[PDB]
Amino acid sequence: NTLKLCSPEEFTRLCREKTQEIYPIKEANGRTRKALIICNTEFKHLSLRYGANFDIIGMKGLLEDLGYDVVVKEELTAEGMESEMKDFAALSEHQTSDSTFLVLMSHGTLHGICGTMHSEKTPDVLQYDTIYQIFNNCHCPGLRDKPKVIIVQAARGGNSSHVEKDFIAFYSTTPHHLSYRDKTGGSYFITRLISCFRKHACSCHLFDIFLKVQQSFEKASIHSQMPTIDRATLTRYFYLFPGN
């Protein structure tokens, strides 16, 4: 419904009692949190992703209610996705932010996300691996020691050096499986993620929220779809303290 807010009190208490178990938060005055959504709907050779727009609008609304200014880029090739993420990684405003969310929504393969021109004769895939190199500590100084949260809405095979740390990835389903949409076309993963954030971001850290999303797919099955936490290297709890 609406994003529920953390009291200033509960904010200040947790930042004081658990200072070394929590990611530090910037107060909103000079804060410039940034978030990126990449979504491909139409494809040169692959089925249309009807309803993807509902997921964009829902997740842009969630991120804004959590204090992020949201960049949305749509219908990209793999090369274009690479280019936008590098431009996004280099943005001044990460210096005055405490975190980021990367939301990727397209057709997917086992190890990558598809661009608009992808086909098995004309492969146009961005490896998920490449995301980690673009945003790591070496190549994105603005987000060092800050949580980089990746949300991936995609099928996962159903299309018929220096330190890496402070990442978490939340995939809509498990490897080799598909993700499903309701009769209006909205993704179940996105719909339940949004409502779970809106109820619990005020009092739960990120990993606890992800887990409640996964519990809902056990309590209310959707075929074999099970959101998956992947390649997680967070070193502290990530509280959002909405409203602060």
UniProtKB/Swiss-Prot annotation:
<keyword id="KW-0496">Mitochondrion</keyword>
<comment type="subunit">
    <text>Heterotetramer that consists of two anti-parallel arranged heterodimers, each one formed by a 20 kDa (Caspase-4 subunit p20) and a 10 kDa (Caspase-4 subunit p10) subunit. Upon direct LPS-binding, forms large homooligomers, resulting in its activation. These oligomers are often referred to as 'non-canonical inflammasomes'. In its precursor form, interacts with TMEM214; this interaction is required for association with the endoplasmic reticulum membrane. Interacts with CASP1. Interacts with NOD2. Interacts with Serpinb1a, Serpinb1b and Serpinb1c; these interactions regulate CASP4 activity.</text>
</comment>
<dbReference type="GO" id="GO:0045087">
    <property type="term" value="P:innate immune response"/>
</dbReference>
<dbReference type="GO" id="GO:0160074">
    <property type="term" value="C:non-canonical inflammasome complex"/>
</dbReference>
<dbReference type="GO" id="GO:0032497">
    <property type="term" value="P:detection of lipopolysaccharide"/>
</dbReference>
<dbReference type="GO" id="GO:0005829">
    <property type="term" value="C:cytosol"/>
</dbReference>
<keyword id="KW-0597">Phosphoprotein</keyword>
<comment type="similarity">
    <text>Belongs to the peptidase C14A family.</text>
</comment>
<feature type="active site">
    <location>
        <position position="155"/>
    </location>
</feature>
<dbReference type="GO" id="GO:0008289">
    <property type="term" value="F:lipid binding"/>
</dbReference>
<keyword id="KW-0645">Protease</keyword>
<dbReference type="GO" id="GO:0005789">
    <property type="term" value="C:endoplasmic reticulum membrane"/>
</dbReference>
<dbReference type="GO" id="GO:0160075">
    <property type="term" value="P:non-canonical inflammasome complex assembly"/>
</dbReference>
<keyword id="KW-1210">Necrosis</keyword>
<dbReference type="GO" id="GO:0141201">
    <property type="term" value="P:pyroptotic cell death"/>
</dbReference>
<protein>
    <recommendedName>
        <fullName>Caspase-4</fullName>
        <ecNumber>3.4.22.64</ecNumber>
    </recommendedName>
</protein>
<dbReference type="GO" id="GO:0061702">
    <property type="term" value="C:canonical inflammasome complex"/>
</dbReference>
<dbReference type="GO" id="GO:0016540">
    <property type="term" value="P:protein autoprocessing"/>
</dbReference>
<keyword id="KW-0391">Immunity</keyword>
<keyword id="KW-0472">Membrane</keyword>
<feature type="active site">
    <location>
        <position position="107"/>
    </location>
</feature>
<keyword id="KW-0865">Zymogen</keyword>
<dbReference type="GO" id="GO:0050830">
    <property type="term" value="P:defense response to Gram-positive bacterium"/>
</dbReference>
<dbReference type="GO" id="GO:0007015">
    <property type="term" value="P:actin filament organization"/>
</dbReference>
<dbReference type="GO" id="GO:0032731">
    <property type="term" value="P:positive regulation of interleukin-1 beta production"/>
</dbReference>
<keyword id="KW-0964">Secreted</keyword>
<keyword id="KW-0788">Thiol protease</keyword>
<dbReference type="GO" id="GO:0042981">
    <property type="term" value="P:regulation of apoptotic process"/>
</dbReference>
<dbReference type="GO" id="GO:0051604">
    <property type="term" value="P:protein maturation"/>
</dbReference>
<dbReference type="GO" id="GO:0004197">
    <property type="term" value="F:cysteine-type endopeptidase activity"/>
</dbReference>
<dbReference type="GO" id="GO:0060907">
    <property type="term" value="P:positive regulation of macrophage cytokine production"/>
</dbReference>
<dbReference type="GO" id="GO:0042742">
    <property type="term" value="P:defense response to bacterium"/>
</dbReference>
<dbReference type="GO" id="GO:0070269">
    <property type="term" value="P:pyroptotic inflammatory response"/>
</dbReference>
<dbReference type="GO" id="GO:0005737">
    <property type="term" value="C:cytoplasm"/>
</dbReference>
<dbReference type="GO" id="GO:2000494">
    <property type="term" value="P:positive regulation of interleukin-18-mediated signaling pathway"/>
</dbReference>
<dbReference type="GO" id="GO:0005576">
    <property type="term" value="C:extracellular region"/>
</dbReference>
<dbReference type="GO" id="GO:0035234">
    <property type="term" value="P:ectopic germ cell programmed cell death"/>
</dbReference>
<dbReference type="GO" id="GO:0050727">
    <property type="term" value="P:regulation of inflammatory response"/>
</dbReference>
<keyword id="KW-0256">Endoplasmic reticulum</keyword>
<feature type="modified residue" description="(Microbial infection) ADP-riboxanated arginine">
    <location>
        <position position="181"/>
    </location>
</feature>
<dbReference type="GO" id="GO:0050729">
    <property type="term" value="P:positive regulation of inflammatory response"/>
</dbReference>
<dbReference type="GO" id="GO:0005739">
    <property type="term" value="C:mitochondrion"/>
</dbReference>
